[PDB]
Structures are given as C-alpha cells and as structure tokens.
Design a protein around this ligand. Structure first.
Ligand SMILES: [Ca+2]
Length: 90
C-alpha cells in the first residue's frame, strides 16, 4: 500500500517543485530506464535531500513497497518513502 494509497497523500505534502529535485536525484539511478529505480539506490538520494535511512524504512520498503514484487521502486513508490520519513523528520 506504500505506493497506492500513500502516493495520494504524498503529493499533498511534497510540491511539484520539490518533485523536480526528487526526480533529478532519482533519474541518475534509473534501472529500467523509465521511471524506475531500485529502492537500495535511495542510500545516495536520501543523502542529497537530507533524509535519514532508518531501520523502520528498510523493514518497511519490503512489506509495504515491494509487496507488489517489482524488485524496484517506481517514481510513485519512491516519492512515498521520501516524504514518509520527511513528514516525521525532526
Ligand atoms: Ca515495488
């Protein structure tokens, strides 16, 4: 449900301007070459936006993101994990 339900609210928190830099860092790790990167790549991207790759997220991405079994994260799967931590990021 990480992508499906969560992307809906994600766009409410993250602005399109924010998405601009999100996709900038995301695009460099494009695995399928279209809108799709591996969730592990986040390690570098998370550093660019200043997000903390915590224990919860690593455990969360498998069951909530890749319940879909893509082995990767589409931009829709990606936006969620960023805003997920960022929303509570103090
Ligand atoms: Ca997936």
């Amino acid at each position: 449900a990480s992508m499906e339900d969560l992307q809906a609210e994600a766009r409410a928190f993250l602005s399109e301007e924010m998405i601009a830099e999100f996709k900038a860092a995301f695009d460099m790790f494009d695995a399928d070459g279209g809108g799709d990167i591996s969730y592990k790549a986040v390690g570098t991207v998370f550093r660019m936006l200043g997000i903390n790759p915590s224990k919860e997220v690593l455990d969360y991405l498998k069951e909530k993101i890749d319940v879909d079994g893509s082995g990767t994260i589409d931009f829709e799967e990606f936006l969620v994990l960023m805003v997920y931590i960022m929303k509570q990021d103090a």
